[PDB]
From a paper:
During maturation of human immunodeficiency virus type 1 (HIV-1), capsid proteins (CA) assemble into a conical core (or capsid) surrounding the viral genome. Formation of a core with optimal stability is a strict requirement for efficient HIV-1 infection. CA folds into two distinct domains connected by a linker: the N-terminal domain (CANTD), composed of seven α-helices and a single β-hairpin, and the C-terminal domain (CACTD), composed of a 310-helix and four α-helices. The cores comprise ~250 CA hexamers and 12 CA pentamers.
Similar rearrangements are observed in the crystal structure of P38A/T216I, presumably due to the P38A mutation. The compensatory T216I is in helix α11΄΄, proximal to helix α7 of the neighboring intra-hexamer subunit that is affected by the P38A mutation. T216I results in subtle rearrangements close to the mutation site in helix α11΄΄ (mutation site I216΄΄, Q219΄΄, V221΄΄), and also affects helix α10 (I201΄΄, L202΄΄, K203΄΄, A204΄΄) and the loop between α10 and α11 (G206΄΄, P207΄΄, G208΄΄). As a result, there is >200% increase in the IA at the 3-fold CACTD-CACTD inter-hexamer interface, as compared to P38A. Moreover, a ~ 5% increase in the IA is observed at the other CA-CA interfaces. Notably, the T216I substitution instead of reversing the structural changes imparted by P38A, it induces subtle rearrangements that may lead to slight stabilization of the hexamers themselves as well as interactions between them, thus partially offsetting the destabilizing effect of P38A. The second-site mutation T216I is at the 3-fold inter-hexamer interface; it induces further rearrangements that may lead to stabilization of interactions between hexamers, thereby partially offsetting the effect of P38A. Under these conditions, P38A CA does not assemble into tubular structures; however, tubular assembly was rescued by T216I. The P38A/T216I cores became slightly more stable than P38A at later time points. Thus, our observed structural changes at the 3-fold interface in P38A/T216I may explain the rescue of the ability to abrogate TRIM5α restriction.
Numbering used by the authors:
A (entry chain A), B (entry chain A), C (entry chain A), D (entry chain A), E (entry chain A), F (entry chain A): 1 to 4, 7 to 221
The structure:
Amino acid sequence: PIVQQGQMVHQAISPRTLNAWVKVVEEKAFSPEVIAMFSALSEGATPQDLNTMLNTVGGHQAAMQMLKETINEEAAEWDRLHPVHAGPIAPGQMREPRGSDIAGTTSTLQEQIGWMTHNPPIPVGEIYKRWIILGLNKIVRMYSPTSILDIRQGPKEPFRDYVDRFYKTLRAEQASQEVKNWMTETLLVQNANPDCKTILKALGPGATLEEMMIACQGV
Amino acid sequence: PIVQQGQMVHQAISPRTLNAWVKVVEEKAFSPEVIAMFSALSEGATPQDLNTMLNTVGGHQAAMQMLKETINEEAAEWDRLHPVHAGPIAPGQMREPRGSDIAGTTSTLQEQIGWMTHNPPIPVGEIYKRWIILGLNKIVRMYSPTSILDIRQGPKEPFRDYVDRFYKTLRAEQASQEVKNWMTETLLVQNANPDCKTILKALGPGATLEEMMIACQGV
Amino acid sequence: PIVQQGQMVHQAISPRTLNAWVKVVEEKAFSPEVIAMFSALSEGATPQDLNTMLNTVGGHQAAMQMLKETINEEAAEWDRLHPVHAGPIAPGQMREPRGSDIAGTTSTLQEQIGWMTHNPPIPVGEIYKRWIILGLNKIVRMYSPTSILDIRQGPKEPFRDYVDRFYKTLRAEQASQEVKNWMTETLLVQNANPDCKTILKALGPGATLEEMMIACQGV
Amino acid sequence: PIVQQGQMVHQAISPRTLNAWVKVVEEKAFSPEVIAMFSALSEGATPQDLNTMLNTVGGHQAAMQMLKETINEEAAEWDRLHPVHAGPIAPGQMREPRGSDIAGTTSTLQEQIGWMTHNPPIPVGEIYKRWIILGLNKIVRMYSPTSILDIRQGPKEPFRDYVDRFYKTLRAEQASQEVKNWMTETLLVQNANPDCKTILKALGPGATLEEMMIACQGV
Amino acid sequence: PIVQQGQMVHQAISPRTLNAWVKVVEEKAFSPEVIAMFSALSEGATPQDLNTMLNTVGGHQAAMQMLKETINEEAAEWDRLHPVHAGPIAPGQMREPRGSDIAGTTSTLQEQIGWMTHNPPIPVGEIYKRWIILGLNKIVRMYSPTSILDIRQGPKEPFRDYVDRFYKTLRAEQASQEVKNWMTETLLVQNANPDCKTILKALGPGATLEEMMIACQGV
Amino acid sequence: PIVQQGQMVHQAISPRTLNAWVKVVEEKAFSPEVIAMFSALSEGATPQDLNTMLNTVGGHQAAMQMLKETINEEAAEWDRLHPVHAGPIAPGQMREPRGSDIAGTTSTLQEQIGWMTHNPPIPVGEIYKRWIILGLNKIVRMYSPTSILDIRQGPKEPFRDYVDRFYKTLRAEQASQEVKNWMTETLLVQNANPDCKTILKALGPGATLEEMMIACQGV
Ligand SMILES: [Cl-]
Ligand SMILES: [Cl-]
Ligand SMILES: [Cl-]
Ligand SMILES: [Cl-]
Ligand SMILES: [Cl-]
Ligand SMILES: [Cl-]
Ligand SMILES: [Cl-]
Ligand SMILES: [Cl-]
Ligand SMILES: [Cl-]
Ligand SMILES: [Cl-]
Ligand SMILES: [Cl-]
Ligand SMILES: [Cl-]
Ligand SMILES: [Cl-]
Ligand SMILES: [Cl-]
Ligand SMILES: [Cl-]
Ligand SMILES: [Cl-]
Ligand SMILES: [Cl-]
Ligand SMILES: [Cl-]
Ligand SMILES: [Cl-]
Ligand SMILES: [Cl-]
Ligand SMILES: [Cl-]
Ligand SMILES: [Cl-]
Ligand SMILES: [Cl-]
Ligand SMILES: [Cl-]
Ligand SMILES: [Cl-]
Ligand SMILES: [Cl-]
Ligand SMILES: [Cl-]
Ligand SMILES: [Cl-]
Ligand SMILES: [Cl-]
Ligand SMILES: [Cl-]
Ligand SMILES: [Cl-]
Ligand SMILES: [Cl-]
Ligand SMILES: [Cl-]
Ligand SMILES: [Cl-]
Ligand SMILES: [Cl-]
Ligand SMILES: [Cl-]
């Protein structure tokens, strides 16, 4: 990483950050908290550090390939928007980055260090990290076993376990916040069991989750 | 976090702080010591760091949703009190924060770093942390299985195990210190078994817990 | 904590200090080494840090309540000795602390940081730590199962196991060093078995523990 | 290692970096993620540090010998390109490195520290690290049990497990990116089972992996 | 501890140093390597830190008492040699230490910090550490089960296991290097079995341990 | 140790370096990777630190004695080459070291710190470390169960397991690189089974290990 006397300084990714990242993917495959874990472990990371984390994953090579193809599509999108001009980089400057420079594959650690601390900074680590999170969300979606359309409360299932399953499956749905808003409002109460489904009607369409779970405790 | 040469400096949340936070929620669900643990692990944290801790929680998504709704209500309360004025942020200043900026969702790490160290500081991490603790207390209450009204000493139960159960259940009650004061004074001795319930009367209504447990050791 | 370039600096309590403190109380309840552990883990701690350690204890809430009542009695003793004067705190100064400010309950981290580093320093962490250790000793006493009066050497019990039990029980007795001096001198040899009890007489009343255990090795 | 106030500074390789490296080779023998692990643990390393990691490997001495012979061939290639001139190293300079100086075997830590920080730097750690990775790839190839030519989808094998096996075996193939490109394009779909092999034809020869795995989910 | 910019600085004893020290005494009681461990963990320690390590030992309170009595005897020896003069400590100076000040029992951390860094330094930590090691050696001796006089090679016992037992028992003998020299030279070969006892004679009285163990490999 | 602002600074050996060193010797006795581990853990170490590591070894006291005798022989060799001159050490200088000063036994930490950082430096830690590694190699040799002369490929033994055993036993042989060169060239192919022994002849006497193991894969 790089961490802010106040003069900025470059460290290697620590063994426990790495060991933490690897044990996470061994245990939980790809799920939403894995991505938070990814983002959490990667604070201030250079592309080198990001590639480190991705190459140390053994197994799951279909997912790691999908992620490779995703990164290349964002790189091509970067290239199209940001064309590379001809001519020699004058003394006292640094070259403008390509898509592959941002993905760590055709840049040195110094150039990554150069872009990140320069005024203004081209935040290449943060740009790349987006592309990686993009591709991880695509994977999470694909490997999510169930659709949110199929989360129905069972006859004896206490309401709170039903809400746990609903929102877990919702967390892995790749759809925008307004869609999610609509599924919370439409599907949650729509797919409850007859008993609770009744009990919640009597609160009204704009009641909180805290209000709804207190309603169906006694049920 | 940010930690105080004496010049302030910004670090990433460490892997063990994170690993500690995750293992805590895996093991103990939501109980009062979890919140102390939360507060303890989050010292000096930015909103980014606070969101990190909350998103790495797998499972319990009903609780994490309730917490989401709580945070939005405090944000709306913040917005109403603190309206955002029109006009461009002049050079040498920083914008005044919205509710969503405080919750890390619509601010950068730099802006969070900006507010926290500026003179005077807008302590956004500390404000957000309150809202999160607010919502965690609401959860602890909801998931507490028993009411304090139902903690009765059993015929053979030594007094000290009864006090352990009383104060554990009391710790999860969401009621102010004066109410708690009253429950200690009224209910504790009121719900003891006939034997100890007698033995404590003979001390009087203003005796300490150390005095009461010595009284009922021999019982 | 705060730790001494030489300019003083404020850190958060580390995850392993915390994890160490919690695992200690899970395992060994309240015994004398727990208090050494407490003191050891708390070096340079602010009241915030001290409260952190105490609130992360799950279970044992009778003990944690007793400790609460103890802290309040020392706070009232502090208040009586140190009254708070009327009038506004002039620029370039800091307020004099109340009992509750010392117990971290009605002070900020900055004020605690203020008192500790100021010239002269009001060492609030160290004052509070005393009150906490005070209340922990009261607990250790109460939860000690046996009295020192009841440690008698058994007929086949080698002398060294008897000395181990004597001094362990003595460590949990809440009585001053001169009392302890007297119990070592009177009770140890007085409660040995007939065989060793004899063998030690022949050394005289002012012989060391090293001399006494060599005496009763062959017995 | 050496890690960037901003003045550069030399540290010893930490016990956990070492312990991490050793446990990796105990567990997983030689596979592609081991090399990422190698590269990851070795950031900023001197040749001393690189030799440290290689000598602490117990077992696998055939592989460690092959690696020895590989390093000597790159050293001889270095020597041939970079001949060592006669004459005394003038005051205010440092000698130009031989192949064996780069491999840490005939240089001090100071000389390695000298080359790495000097202006311009001879990056000896990074040069050596290449030679080591070179020899590790040769080992991974040799110890890979299967050829990519033999990865055929089985009749009941869901497509995603087949892709996992394909790309895992591909990761250990020592052939350039254009060859790999060709194997992805030719062999993957060519070696699928009749069912999926059909289903993918109907997308066309230029469809993504995300598109192909969605195609064969329902199969 | 205190550890050497170059300006000296005071740290708390770390949780793992402490946890390491406690686990050592739980596992191995008192043996020679425990003392090396003690010395090793205590580098640069103040008396506070030394007392920390000693009070966190649960169990073994006979040994910890013996150690208490030993420390008091060295303190009285210190007092007799170093009498405390009358009169007020002038501004710009610090008091001369008593025996109890050196044992951490009647001094603050500041005074310990004062003596250690002052010019000239009174190295109180190092003086106390001696007294503690003194008392630990006395304990190791006492708790050593066997005398070196009783280590005889058995008829089938390979020579190297006999040497392992000899020198282990010798390490716990409290006798000076010249005595140890004599026991190596007299007893080792004197207590070997008839076979090896012969075989070594034929080398002569001034042969090394490497020479003697090669001699008795084939036996 | 001592580790390079750029001003040099002295640290204590860390608990995990120590714990790592002790667990290594508990597990693997004395083998070549133990020595790499030794060298690896001891980077920048003073003689104090080196003695720390050696005294914390419990068990194996025959080996630790042999090592003691070895160190004394190198000390006597040092003394003979480097005689100690008469006369008082003038102000602004430091004494020249004896053999026992280098072995940490008759020098302070300050004097060790003095020699190591002075211009020019007498690198006492590095000199001592050599003597210790010298004596460890002598031990490894002695405790190696098998001679390289006895490593013969068995009839069904795949070639690669045979190479693993050959080079493992070779790593523990105490003979120079030219001897080792000769054993690789003469014995390896000379002691293979009839089948492989044939197959390798047909490559010629100057073929690599990578070439030889590919040759005997199909066998
Ligand atoms: Cl820094
Ligand atoms: Cl680390
Ligand atoms: Cl997956
Ligand atoms: Cl890779
Ligand atoms: Cl940009
Ligand atoms: Cl479900
Ligand atoms: Cl800093
Ligand atoms: Cl960490
Ligand atoms: Cl919960
Ligand atoms: Cl998330
Ligand atoms: Cl504010
Ligand atoms: Cl209960
Ligand atoms: Cl600092
Ligand atoms: Cl930590
Ligand atoms: Cl308790
Ligand atoms: Cl709390
Ligand atoms: Cl005061
Ligand atoms: Cl007892
Ligand atoms: Cl530094
Ligand atoms: Cl470390
Ligand atoms: Cl292998
Ligand atoms: Cl080696
Ligand atoms: Cl170069
Ligand atoms: Cl396969
Ligand atoms: Cl410092
Ligand atoms: Cl630590
Ligand atoms: Cl013991
Ligand atoms: Cl104590
Ligand atoms: Cl002195
Ligand atoms: Cl024995
Ligand atoms: Cl430093
Ligand atoms: Cl450490
Ligand atoms: Cl051995
Ligand atoms: Cl020792
Ligand atoms: Cl020299
Ligand atoms: Cl073998």
